[PDB]
Motif scaffolding. Structure first.
Motif, PDB file in Angstrom:
ATOM      1  N   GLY A   1      43.285  34.603  40.063  1.00  0.00           N
ATOM      2  CA  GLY A   1      44.652  34.907  39.679  1.00  0.00           C
ATOM      3  C   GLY A   1      45.404  35.649  40.773  1.00  0.00           C
ATOM      4  O   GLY A   1      46.506  35.251  41.176  1.00  0.00           O
ATOM      5  N   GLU A   2      44.794  36.728  41.259  1.00  0.00           N
ATOM      6  CA  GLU A   2      45.352  37.527  42.343  1.00  0.00           C
ATOM      7  C   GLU A   2      45.552  36.668  43.611  1.00  0.00           C
ATOM      8  O   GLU A   2      46.524  36.840  44.365  1.00  0.00           O
ATOM      9  N   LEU A   3      44.637  35.721  43.817  1.00  0.00           N
ATOM     10  CA  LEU A   3      44.747  34.769  44.909  1.00  0.00           C
ATOM     11  C   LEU A   3      45.955  33.891  44.758  1.00  0.00           C
ATOM     12  O   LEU A   3      46.657  33.664  45.711  1.00  0.00           O
TER      13      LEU A   3
ATOM     14  N   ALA B   1      36.038  35.218  38.892  1.00  0.00           N
ATOM     15  CA  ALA B   1      37.116  34.443  38.261  1.00  0.00           C
ATOM     16  C   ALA B   1      38.429  35.224  38.269  1.00  0.00           C
ATOM     17  O   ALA B   1      39.476  34.721  38.696  1.00  0.00           O
ATOM     18  N   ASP B   2      38.343  36.460  37.779  1.00  0.00           N
ATOM     19  CA  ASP B   2      39.428  37.427  37.824  1.00  0.00           C
ATOM     20  C   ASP B   2      40.169  37.360  39.152  1.00  0.00           C
ATOM     21  O   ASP B   2      41.394  37.436  39.181  1.00  0.00           O
ATOM     22  N   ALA B   3      39.417  37.201  40.241  1.00  0.00           N
ATOM     23  CA  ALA B   3      40.003  37.097  41.589  1.00  0.00           C
ATOM     24  C   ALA B   3      41.042  35.976  41.789  1.00  0.00           C
ATOM     25  O   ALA B   3      42.121  36.205  42.361  1.00  0.00           O
TER      26      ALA B   3
ATOM     27  N   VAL C   1      34.488  44.389  41.715  1.00  0.00           N
ATOM     28  CA  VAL C   1      34.084  43.076  42.169  1.00  0.00           C
ATOM     29  C   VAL C   1      35.302  42.231  42.470  1.00  0.00           C
ATOM     30  O   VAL C   1      35.303  41.487  43.445  1.00  0.00           O
ATOM     31  N   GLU C   2      36.344  42.378  41.649  1.00  0.00           N
ATOM     32  CA  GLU C   2      37.576  41.634  41.862  1.00  0.00           C
ATOM     33  C   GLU C   2      38.164  42.013  43.218  1.00  0.00           C
ATOM     34  O   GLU C   2      38.194  41.191  44.139  1.00  0.00           O
ATOM     35  N   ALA C   3      38.582  43.269  43.343  1.00  0.00           N
ATOM     36  CA  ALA C   3      39.278  43.753  44.535  1.00  0.00           C
ATOM     37  C   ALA C   3      38.573  43.369  45.833  1.00  0.00           C
ATOM     38  O   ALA C   3      39.177  42.766  46.738  1.00  0.00           O
TER      39      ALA C   3
END
Ligand SMILES: [Mg+2]
Ligand SMILES: [Mg+2]
Ligand SMILES: [Mg+2]
Ligand SMILES: [Mg+2]
Ligand SMILES: [Mg+2]
Lengths: 189, 187, 190, 190, 190, 189, 190, 187
Positions: H117-119, H113-115, H82-84
């Motif tokens: 951070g990567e953003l 939410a995890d996303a 879901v993140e990726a």
């Protein structure tokens, strides 16, 4: 029979706990929505939400007839109420430490500190909307709040919950806001 | 001016905490001493220390006006008192559940399970000095406390504390006592 | 000049702490060693080890000049020393709370409470040998330690630390030593 | 009588703990009050609060006869005192490492490190009010403290505690305050 | 190429782990099956299961070329094997300490200790069926194992692990089985 | 809207969890009551209780339409059902491993092992009532259960829950029962 | 005779473990020492300490004859060695994953990941000095370590232990080193 | 004969656990690789690895018939996927919440939410190489994920996992990115 007494008591306590959860829950939904509103500009909406939340706080105050539990759950909810309230009050110029609610000292102080980070976020959005004056007055209330709250650091952090840490957080955030202000002035060239 | 108010209140709470701390400590010392005497044999002086303690308990019953604390600190001493009392009642035939002390359901119940251990230690000592009557009566009471308290096990652990685990511990002590008693009867 | 000072004190404290660590651990080891040598019957060799320990103890006392570090590490090795000594005195009829060395009060108390269980070991084994007399004496001293110790449970933690837990431990141990004493009395017959 | 001596010393120690705790607390309330005053400007009342606190340090030093409890509990308050002092000195242009107190080296080092953050806050708040001067002198004492302090982290953490983290924090503030300085410079061409 | 060597060795190691685990498991299933058989009486099939297991010990020893993983994971199964063996020997009147296996000393000592409880169980179950003989011979090997084994607990626990606890357990059973023996004696006068 | 879907889903799950708690709760009350009854002699009463409990298990089986949660709570309840059942069955001569219920392998094996300690307690009460034959047949079923359950030890204890430990407990208890029997015969002189 | 053997092995392993502990801890200390000496500017003295460590390492490798104990204690000291070496190579332009010594794979990986943070320290300080070139270099190697390491997160724990945690650590550290790099570019001006 | 039945079922479960373990591991290697490529720039190959992963996900969707496990192991990988996915959607303008993957509400939400951070890592890197447009679009999406996801915070933590804490973390990352962007605009 004392056993039947303690049994009845236990059922009372259980039902109690359940509904109290429900109430505090709704109250916190209203608090939060209110904060998001203010953040996105819709402050009348916010006011109304806050109003709902206070009514719910009356329903909560109803339950202090079982002081075991209650405090074992309320705190959180209460802080955010305080937080959100101060927040509207700050961005509206009507900011004061004179919030006269039926709330615990720890919840009150921590809500107020909690508002600091909110004001940083606001002051950042304004800063980026090229609005420097709102940013600056927000910063003014951040500072004010901090300076006044430290006075309470002396008390044993068990008595006042996690204040000291929270305040150090706030502090560093205040400084970050200031660095940003400066960088925004230079970068508005 | 509010901030000054919540600060006065804080100062209060601090004072009250210090005081409750000292009360409860005293009360514990007494509950403890009471047990140690009930084991040592000086049951009268046990009744004395116990009375002193309960007096201190009515001294504790003031700080309800400070619910922000109170309960929190109180339990482990209240539960202690409830223990000693029940112990006396069993080692002088007069074992009952119906005692009034106004104590949190948890400290009440758990105080009664807590008792069973002290009963098996007693029962055992008596078993060593020949007294099978002691020991048998204790087995009766012990089994009763277990049989009765188990009714409250279905309750959320968050209100009844960890009653189940204390109970299983007791149960096992009961078996080990029944067994230690089928022995010794080998004289 | 100030920093020169607090720096020198620091380096000093560093070397000191290293050496203290070595001596403390050797002491502890020797204490424990003695306790297991008794439970193995080589009570003389156990006397030799306990001697070695009580000697090293001195060299440890020499580090009280550095009250910074001396105290954050004192506890455990000396808890063990107290244990081994309590035990020795107990398995030798002349048991006493009066052991002419301090040694922190916490270490002292926890040490006796910890020697309760080694006493149960010795008492169950004495029970197996056949000897009920020595068994009953050990059971006496165990019970005595439990009683004389419970008096300090009042005091908070911090000052006392281990006590409460170690005494409930010693307690359950006493119940078991007893149960075993009762099933042991099927002689009586024979 | 061993159990009675130990009971005695126990009562003494708990008492001593109560006292030490209250007095340390006091010393601290003044330390903090002081730093607030400095940040307000009221440097006079600041120096007064410092005074009261350093008076308290006497009552506190009076307890190093109970080394157990004294070297545990003492750190915070002392360390914060050193912070207040070093801070005040730095803003009075009279900054030195030559504070002299009966104080544990960790508390000392950490007091200076801790002062660095308070300097950066003062330096930003000035640099906001224009005072480019005060700012730059502050950055100066900042780099000073970091630079001479960093040679003490060749010491094992247990002797030196939070220093590392504090110096990390310190380092950061330094680098950031620099930027801030420069940014205000171009900010106030206009 | 350092990262590539490391990945290789990694893949190897995880694989080796999967295998070792399955094989160890096997050895164990037979160890247990064996002890159950002895408790049933079927000493023949017992001896067979022992066989299968000791065959497995070859496949297992084949892994001591990966000392990482080998000395961690190996203990249980090995230890339990030594238990089965020593047990079966004891009940065939042919009990000896002279089992020879490529096996870690903890596992060895612990295997004997562990056997003692299985002996006590057998001795009770016989003593219930009357066989006073079998019982007494069992108690004999029990005391033997405990008595010889106890001199190994002069070793620091990390080298010797659960031995102490097991010997504790052992001791208990010994003392109790004695009781039981005697009780059945007076039981079967009548 | 996927957000509203996951929202609705979350509410469903919450209500679900609450009532499932209630059901499993009542079930466990019945189980336990049943065991105390059997212990005190009143086995017809016990039967009826167990009956109630099985009906409640039907209501539980209803919920497996949300396999997230469910198993995250059921286990306990289920074991004891199993336990109690086996218990009646053992003290009644109608003992069997052929309990045909909609239950998990781990719950099943652990319930059955759990029954051993119950039988020890029973056999102890009988022993003390000078009844040696009931004691002895209980002991027989304890033994049988153990001997048969060990067969499963092989499986990774993650897969079978805390079986191995549980069985070692049982075992030691069995031995204690036996020592006791012997001591009861000698002490009945 | 069997027991004589596994006994002698035991005593042997006891002395060995003692000595291994001393040597391991000295090695670790020297490693860390070197790392802080670099962050304090005395890079030569740091060269000296790191030398001392790499020497002691050999005496440590000599204990592989006892695969019982050698592995339960390997990890930490060598993790530190790998760290200090990675760091040295990085602050000296000639950084490489190719360090010709093994050393367990877990220790290796965790070591590099742990050197990421010392790299941020060095990079922020390089940023303060003024030097952006070296700063960008360090940021490159940091990022490189992060990428080359994440590839091993697939593997379970046990074999790898620290990894995923330490890499999320390194990650947030990289984001901060970057943010600092950006607010550092207000020069640019000057 | 029951015991034999539950024995067969156990063997089954063991097999299924081993297999699910390996599937999910593979899937997470892919999700991870996908992210690392989206950062590295190879967005196409990120789309590829992502596709292989989702294929493996439909391979995961079998073991529902073994609810005694499944969910337990699945979450951290599902949440990873879901993140990726979300990440890709945001770094190619096509950011939406409406994706269908049949994933536990927790892994869904927490994946989003995890996303964030990567953003912020991405947005930051772009900010270093001058790209203010990337960074600004990311600030938009980031703020959206936060604003929307906060609606689910009032739910019991036992069902929504620890969404609140993850969210505060994100918020803070958003501020630190807004700030990092007010810098750099100082060129
Ligand atoms: Mg907030
Ligand atoms: Mg400060
Ligand atoms: Mg065994
Ligand atoms: Mg049960
Ligand atoms: Mg991520």
């Amino acid at each position: 029979m004392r056993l039947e007494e303690c049994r009845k008591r236990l059922e009372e306590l259980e039902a109690a706990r359940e509904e109290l959860l429900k109430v505090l829950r709704e109250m916190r939904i209203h608090s939060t929505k209110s904060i998001a509103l203010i953040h996105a500009g819709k402050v009348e909406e916010a006011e109304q939400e806050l109003k709902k939340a206070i009514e719910l706080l009356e329903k909560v105050k109803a339950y202090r007839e079982y002081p075991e539990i209650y405090f074992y759950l309320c705190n959180d909810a209460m802080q955010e109420l305080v937080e959100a309230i101060a927040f509207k009050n700050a961005i509206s110029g009507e900011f004061t430490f004179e919030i006269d609610l039926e709330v615990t000292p720890a919840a009150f102080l921590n809500g107020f500190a909690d508002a600091v980070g909110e004001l940083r976020r606001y002051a950042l959005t304004k800063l980026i909307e090229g609005d420097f004056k709102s940013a600056e007055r927000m910063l003014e209330v951040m500072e004010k709040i901090y300076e006044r709250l430290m006075e309470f650091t002396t008390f044993p952090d068990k008595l006042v919950s996690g204040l000291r840490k929270k305040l150090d957080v706030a502090r560093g955030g205040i400084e970050r806001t200031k660095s940003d202000y400066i960088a925004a002035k230079v970068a508005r060239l």
